[PDB]
Amino acid sequence: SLVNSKLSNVKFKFINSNIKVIKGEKFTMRLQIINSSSSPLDLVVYYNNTINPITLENQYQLHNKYRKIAEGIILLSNDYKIPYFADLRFIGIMSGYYGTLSGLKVLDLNTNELIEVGNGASVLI
C-alpha cells in the first residue's frame, strides 16, 4: 500500500484497491500524495517505456521480465504536473499479472532523485 520517501515527508498510496480486474480496455487509477507543505509541489511522473538493456536462461529471463514491464501498459498522461489528488491515466496492451508494476517514476524537480512507486497490481483477465 504505502512506501515512504527518501528526501521529503511524501508518502504514496493508491486509493483504488491494489488488486483489480480489467480487460484490455481503459481503466481509472488514483494515487495519494501526502507530504509536508514546505514545498508541497513540483513532482513529475513518467512511465519510461524502454527496455532495461541487461547464466543463459537467466539472461533470457531478465530480458523477458523487462520486455513485459516496458510493453504491457502505457500511461496516457505522462509528464503529469501534480498541483493533492491526481487520477493517473493508463491503458494496458497485453495481459498477465503486473504485480509491482514498476515502470512509473515520480521525481522531485529540485535535487533529482529517481523516486519509484513499486506498488499495486493489475490482472488483465
Binding site: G24, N49, E71, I74, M94
Partner: protein
Amino acid sequence: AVPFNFTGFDLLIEYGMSATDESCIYLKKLSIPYEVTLRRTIEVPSMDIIPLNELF
C-alpha cells in the same frame, strides 16, 4: 498561407518592382515594413513507439 514557419520568424517585407519600358530594364524599388507575431497554438514536444502482441 502560414503553415510552415520557424519560431524565429518575426517580420516580412515587400520590395515591389515598379516597371515601365519601351526596350529597357527601367524599374525602381518600393519597400514596405511588416511586423507580425505568432500564435503558438499546439505543439507535439515528444513521441515514442510501442509495438503490440495481443489479439483483441
